[PDB]
Design an enzyme around this catalytic site. Structure first.
Site, PDB file in Angstrom:
ATOM      1  N   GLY A   1       0.945  -1.547  -0.360  1.00  0.00           N
ATOM      2  CA  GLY A   1       0.039  -0.058  -0.215  1.00  0.00           C
ATOM      3  C   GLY A   1       0.541   1.056  -0.025  1.00  0.00           C
TER       4      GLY A   1
ATOM      5  CD1 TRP B   1       6.444   0.315  -4.516  1.00  0.00           C
ATOM      6  CD2 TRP B   1       4.719  -0.236  -5.615  1.00  0.00           C
ATOM      7  NE1 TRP B   1       7.276   0.236  -5.597  1.00  0.00           N
ATOM      8  CE2 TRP B   1       5.918  -0.210  -6.358  1.00  0.00           C
ATOM      9  CE3 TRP B   1       3.695  -1.034  -5.325  1.00  0.00           C
ATOM     10  CZ2 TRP B   1       6.160  -0.191  -7.653  1.00  0.00           C
ATOM     11  CZ3 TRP B   1       3.329  -1.190  -7.157  1.00  0.00           C
ATOM     12  CH2 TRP B   1       4.215  -1.032  -8.265  1.00  0.00           C
ATOM     13  CG  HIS B   2       0.241   0.865  -4.784  1.00  0.00           C
ATOM     14  ND1 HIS B   2       0.012   0.062  -4.486  1.00  0.00           N
ATOM     15  CD2 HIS B   2      -0.278   1.099  -6.478  1.00  0.00           C
ATOM     16  CE1 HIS B   2      -0.138  -1.260  -4.935  1.00  0.00           C
ATOM     17  NE2 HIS B   2      -0.098  -0.482  -6.743  1.00  0.00           N
ATOM     18  N   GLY B   3       1.706   4.599  -2.428  1.00  0.00           N
ATOM     19  CA  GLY B   3       2.118   5.909  -2.123  1.00  0.00           C
ATOM     20  C   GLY B   3       1.882   5.863  -0.396  1.00  0.00           C
TER      21      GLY B   3
END
Lengths: 79, 414
Positions: B333, B335-337
């Site tokens: 999560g 990693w997406h932002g």
């Protein structure tokens, strides 16, 4: 003890099943080791054998039989 | 000099069908080359860098320098660890080196939190390139990697088809694949594969995702915002429309990347395997964004579980797994932002996978409680399967509503 006969002991120490003479069994097919069972064995293999065995490279084809775990223990013990 | 790059020509990576005429002409020597067991080292390097540069020369064309910083930064730390790991080997040295390798990407993600702007270290591929880089740090740590040229390393880490957002790879397999060119029939077998993937991608991206994405979604959003509240029927609308758009846009892109990859000899890992027909939340992650999922399995999940068993931090078998799922998906999560909805989508599949895991074990406990009671095992047939598929599909689609951050506009216009 030998590096084949000692693995024979631990396998039924926290799972309770014998695969001595018929050992080429795929234990993922046999229903002995689950998805979280491997880690449990590998940690007692990490403890008793004193060998650190990696997990990022571990594949389904690699260490599936009781022979390909015995023959993989001798390879990661010296070279 | 920033001004020079904004002057520089710019090509959207698989942006139009017109893009393939260039890249085709461009790849053509390389591909013919492979038939005679030859690679054109300098030329490949040239064609790679041009199409990479073209991909990064937008209005924010400055990001290309961010890339070159990134390359130097990676070489510094990748080799720092290579040199270290030869002689001695330590837990904390590895930890530090990992952190340093991921740090640029961490700054990129954290920058809108602190500021409201993107980091200067931010370029396009950063999110997907970092995996390739840490890949080696992790692999050297395990002793499964010893030898590599700066050539080999850079070739892998800045591979052009899978650069922009492409399928994530591991060094050992990529380098092995590049190392031996595939033989003649196997090679033009890949051409068939490529022309199939390009055509499907054309449909997936330019047609189907056009319909869901730019056609049906923007009015449905406008409708859902107009009606207001925590939810409405147009919000259920945007849930499915986006869900398919997210799928087609990405899956088509993936196929493009795979095809182009195939034309450069190497066969990159696959990203989708009909993910919607999955009965299971476990099966979904064996079918959705696979290269990312499989990476996180073997590098984030498996490795955290190993820690929780070396230490035996948690009491029983199942809780270690459940902590691992929650943490593992939560990282993804992040990693997406670092936005609420990404971390939300993170924890969603977290609690999702734990629910799913507990149910599978509760199904066996209900089958043990019936078979030893006098009844026949609880029914499994076509409609039971279908129900699973239905439940999975809607959970998944809901997560995509979260992931879109449409809920951010629906709930908090404020």
């Amino acid at each position: 003890m030998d590096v084949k006969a000692e693995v024979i002991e631990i396998i039924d120490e926290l799972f309770m099943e014998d695969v001595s003479d018929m050992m080429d069994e795929d234990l993922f097919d046999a229903g002995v080791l689950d998805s979280m069972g491997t880690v449990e064995l590998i940690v007692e293999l990490e403890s008793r054998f004193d060998i650190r065995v990696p997990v990022s490279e571990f594949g389904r084809d690699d260490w599936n039989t009781a022979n390909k775990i015995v023959e993989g223990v001798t390879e990661l013990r010296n070279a | 000099m920033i001004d020079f790059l904004k002057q520089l020509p710019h090509l959207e990576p698989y942006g139009n069908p017109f893009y393939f005429i260039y890249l085709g002409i461009a790849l053509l020597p390389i591909f013919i080359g492979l038939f005679f067991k030859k690679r054109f080292a300098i030329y490949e390097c040239l064609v790679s860098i041009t199409f990479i540069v073209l991909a990064l020369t937008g209005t924010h064309a400055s990001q290309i320098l961010a890339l070159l910083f990134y390359i130097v930064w990676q070489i510094i730390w990748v080799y720092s660890y290579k040199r270290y790991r030869s002689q001695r080997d330590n837990k904390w040295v590895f930890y530090l080196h990992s952190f340093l390798v991921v740090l640029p990407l961490i700054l990129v993600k954290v920058e809108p939190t602190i500021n409201g702007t993107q980091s200067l270290l931010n370029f396009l591929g950063i999110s997907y390139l970092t995996f390739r880089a840490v890949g080696m740090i992790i692999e050297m740590r395990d002793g499964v990697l010893k030898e590599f040229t700066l050539g080999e390393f850079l070739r892998f880490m800045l591979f052009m088809p899978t650069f922009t957002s492409g399928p994530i790879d591991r060094f050992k397999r990529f380098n092995e694949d590049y190392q031996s060119i595939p033989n003649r029939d196997e090679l033009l077998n890949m051409l068939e594969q490529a022309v199939k993937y390009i055509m499907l991608g054309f449909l997936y991206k330019f047609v189907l995702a056009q319909i869901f994405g730019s056609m049906l979604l923007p009015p449905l959003k406008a409708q859902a915002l107009s009606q207001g509240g925590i939810f409405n029927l147009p919000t259920l609308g945007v849930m499915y429309v986006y869900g398919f758009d997210l799928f087609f846009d990405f899956a088509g892109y993936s196929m493009f990347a795979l095809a182009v990859s195939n034309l450069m000899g190497i066969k990159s890992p696959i990203n989708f395997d009909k993910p919607f027909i999955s009965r299971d939340m476990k099966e979904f992650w064996n079918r959705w964004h696979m290269s990312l999922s499989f990476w996180f399995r073997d590098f984030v999940f498996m490795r955290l579980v190993i820690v929780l068993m070396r230490n035996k931090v948690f009491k029983n078998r199942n809780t270690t797994s459940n902590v691992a799922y929650i943490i593992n998906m939560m990282v993804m999560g992040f990693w997406h932002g670092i936005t609420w909805y990404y971390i939300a989508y993170g924890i969603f599949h977290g609690i999702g996978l734990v629910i799913n895991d507990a149910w599978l074990r509760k199904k066996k406990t209900i089958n043990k409680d019936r078979k030893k009671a006098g009844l026949k095992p609880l029914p499994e047939n076509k409609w039971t399967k279908a129900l699973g598929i239905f439940i999975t599909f809607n959970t998944v689609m809901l997560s995509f509503l979260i992931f879109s951050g449409f809920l951010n506009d629906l709930w908090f216009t404020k």
